[PDB]
Design a binder for this molecule. Structure first.
Ligand SMILES: OC[C@H]1O[C@@H](O)[C@H](O)[C@@H](O)[C@@H]1O
Ligand SMILES: [Ca+2]
Length: 769
């Protein structure tokens, strides 16, 4: 490996061998079907609301999130980088697809597949990833840095459906070597969203943009139809000329054929035919190829940028609504703009790299933090782009100031912005894209007094319930299978209108969003104040025994949606205390004296009773009425965790909080698989895991990172990092279960998982407050 020295990969990048097999991988531990796309994954490409494309560590473009809200894992074999090298003095050169695998059928059989093992590495530190190619039959060493411009406090480039591939080539040998790098791409119009004739009308064109000191050559892969539909638009690939390289291209090769129409050209001398051909296809799949060729002398380095864009302007949801994606604000809505996007990237990528470096640098340069923590912190952010992210710039056919936003909880439970989960998972948005965060919270504010009297069947017990109750915060803002933003509470396993955490979490999120953006946004507190008051007032009505605290009803009426709570619970009870304290403070800020006084009164009574009912000398009991009410819950003081973040002070005595956290570390962490797998949710005082429900026996990744953040603010530095390290290890390490770029909600002691690609572990960003 002589190429690593010519590029700059941070030491905290996650690493794996190209073609590496992983032997320890986990699988779903539930009885119903659940997504398991394997451990062959990578950092995604694509902006927020753009649709994303997962290119895996083996080099394939395989995890397709271009249909917004859906996860489709299938390698499109035509989409690759390939290399040709010939040493001056040899009769023949060699050509190789940079893909550690081969197609399942006979398409593209002429291409040279099966990039060999032990011949290169993949590295990731989101939004950047890299591949290095160090192969005994390739005298010139190559590396590529690939990324999309995901930039905090930037709502523009961050939305773009674009990726850059910056190649570096170095000749460590003592002979001249001719090198070519080729990007191939299938015209994927019709890959989704087209019910019949899936390739029909697809055609490819070549754009040559020549102006002083710029030449870009690109393929634009579109369809002859000018219809405005979810399925129509354009893909583009292309390259910018640099001194010392020549560009060649092929406009049309057949992807549903043996590939030799292209490969016979490339494998001969690394130079394509430059054949334009706009003839549309009927049944056959088609693709384009863009290549560069250059000669490297001994000791010479060259850098060359390629790019990929996709202009698919319309997203459609299963309930019928069609919306424009956010990037259309910057490039237009007609779906004929892939070249403009590609050009913007090829002309600005150096600036983008520097903007990404500038935001990562404060963390990366802090030598008090271990590298493993940096690996997790940055790579967990993959989910902001990969989570079915929807960001609208108008409804199609619509005759507004704001752009609605939604991140899925996950793909198996296909719900937008699940509030009980975003309480943990939304930290990166508030910290790094706060205008999006405030938009999402205003969306929730607007739902508070919505009433929907239609009924649904509750999944857990079969009872009928009202869809949406006035004054109750919704569980979610809909499903991609239905009508995001329009039809709320798609979730139906339990009835969220009787949950005891949603209304409190809502309030806490509101105050969080004010505090963590500088305590300056009074307008945001003004917009949300009525809903905050309404939310707390409605929750107060659920106090059945006048102790001043809402009663859990002996069923799962909160985020642990199979784990029953009854009476006053540490979890919902502490959230309530904190939410009352937050509402007092908002009342002070907005000079609503009667609100301040009322919530202060409720707080003092509830606080006194919470401590009496639950403090047992060592920790706070799980609740007051359940069969295992004395279980040690990992999340027992969630309200105090948020109070620390919101700077609301002590809601419970410092000494008692410290004792509780120490007990959780001693038990839920250190007595669960020797503290190497996170914090298990429920443990009995005798040190055996609580078996009352599956959720008690799970580690929740986002709960564990949040608990780590809580320990950290409370000075328990070693315990905080040791607690988080188990989640990092399970996710990323060779000794783990292979969950990189698909961090799940939960695992059990055997390492197997529930709900890969989950929002909650974005809570790791709470460790940076
Ligand atoms: O793992 C528990 C989670 O399951 C999901 O199906 C629900 O939508 C969440 O509200 C819940 O917290
Ligand atoms: Ca009560």
């Amino acid at each position: 490996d002589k190429i690593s020295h010519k590029i700059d990969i941070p030491d905290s990048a996650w690493t794996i061998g190209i073609g590496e097999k992983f032997k320890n991988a986990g699988h779903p531990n539930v009885k119903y079907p659940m997504i398991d796309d394997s451990y062959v994954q990578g950092a995604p490409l694509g902006g927020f609301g753009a649709g994303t494309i997962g290119r895996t560590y083996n080099g394939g473009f395989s995890r397709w999130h271009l249909e917004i809200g859906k996860n489709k894992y299938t390698t499109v074999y035509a989409n690759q980088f390939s290399v040709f090298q010939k040493v001056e003095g040899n009769k023949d050169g060699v050509a190789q697809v940079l893909y550690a695998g081969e197609p399942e059928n006979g398409y593209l059989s002429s291409w040279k597949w099966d990039y060999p093992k032990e011949s290169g590495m993949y590295y990731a530190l989101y939004p950047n990833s890299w591949y290095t190619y160090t192969n005994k039959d390739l005298p010139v060493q190559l590396a590529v840095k690939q990324f999309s411009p995901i930039i905090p406090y930037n709502y523009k480039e961050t939305s773009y459906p674009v990726a850059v591939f910056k190649w570096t080539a170095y000749n460590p040998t003592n002979k001249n070597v001719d090198v070519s790098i080729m990007f191939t791409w299938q015209n994927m119009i019709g890959f989704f969203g087209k019910q019949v004739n899936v390739n029909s009308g697809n055609f490819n064109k070549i754009i040559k943009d020549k102006s002083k000191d710029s030449e870009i050559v690109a393929a634009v892969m579109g369809n002859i139809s000018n219809d405005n539909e979810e399925w129509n638009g354009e893909y583009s690939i292309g390259v910018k000329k640099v001194p010392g390289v020549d560009i060649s291209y092929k406009a049309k090769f057949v992807t549903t054929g043996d590939g030799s129409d292209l490969w016979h050209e490339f494998s001969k001398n690394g130079i394509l035919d430059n054949k334009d051909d706009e003839t549309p296809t009927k049944q056959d799949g088609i693709g384009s190829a863009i290549a560069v060729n250059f000669k490297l002398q001994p000791g010479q380095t060259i850098e060359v940028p390629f790019a990929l864009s996709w202009d698919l302007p319309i997203m459609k949801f299963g309930g019928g609504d069609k919306w424009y994606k956010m990037y259309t604000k910057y490039f237009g809505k007609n779906g004929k703009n892939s070249f403009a996007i590609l050009k913007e990237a090829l002309n600005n990528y150096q600036k983008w790299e520097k903007m990404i470096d500038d935001w990562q640098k404060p963390i990366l340069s802090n030598k008090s933090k271990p590298d493993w923590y940096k690996t997790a912190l940055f790579n967990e952010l993959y989910y902001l782009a990969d989570g079915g992210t929807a960001w609208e710039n108008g409804k199609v056919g619509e005759k507004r100031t704001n752009n609605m936003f939604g991140l899925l909880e996950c793909f198996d439970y296909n719900y937008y912005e699940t509030l009980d989960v975003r309480f943990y998972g939304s930290f990166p948005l508030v910290m790094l894209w706060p205008d999006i965060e405030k938009q999402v919270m205003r969306q929730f504010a607007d739902t508070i007094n919505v009433q929907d009297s239609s009924e649904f069947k509750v999944g857990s017990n079969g009872a009928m319930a009202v869809k949406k109750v006035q004054g109750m915060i919704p569980h979610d803002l809909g499903s991609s299978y239905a009508l995001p933003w329009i039809k709320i509470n798609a979730y139906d396993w339990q009835n969220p209108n009787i949950w005891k955490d949603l209304n409190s979490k809502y309030v806490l999120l509101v105050y969080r969003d004010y505090v963590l953006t500088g305590k300056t946004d009074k307008e945001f507190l003004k917009y949300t104040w009525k809903s905050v008051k309404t939310a707390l007032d409605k929750l107060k009505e659920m106090d059945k025994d006048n102790d001043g605290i809402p009663d859990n009803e002996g069923i799962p009426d909160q985020t642990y949606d199979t784990w029953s709570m009854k009476g006053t619970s540490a979890y919902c009870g502490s959230l309530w205390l904190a939410a009352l304290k937050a509402a007092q403070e908002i009342g002070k800020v907005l000079k609503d004296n009667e609100a301040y006084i009322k919530y202060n009164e409720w707080y003092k009574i509830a606080q006194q009773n919470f401590e009496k009912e639950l403090w047992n000398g060592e920790y706070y009991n799980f609740d007051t009425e359940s069969d295992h009410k004395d279980s040690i819950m990992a999340d027992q003081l969630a309200g105090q965790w948020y109070a620390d973040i919101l700077r609301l002070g002590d809601i419970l005595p410092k000494d008692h909080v410290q004792k509780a956290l120490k007990k959780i570390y001693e038990f839920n962490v250190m007595k669960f698989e020797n503290g190497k797998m996170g914090a298990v949710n429920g443990m009995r005082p005798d040190g055996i895991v609580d078996e009352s429900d599956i959720q008690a026996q799970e580690v929740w990744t986002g709960v564990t990172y949040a608990l780590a953040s809580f320990m950290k603010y409370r000075g328990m530095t070693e315990e905080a990092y040791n607690t988080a390290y188990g989640v990092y290890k399970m996710t990323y390490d060779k000794s783990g279960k292979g969950y990189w770029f698909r961090t799940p909600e939960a695992w059990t002691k055997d390492g197997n998982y529930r709900a890969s690609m989950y929002m909650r572990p974005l809570s790791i960003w709470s460790m940076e407050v």
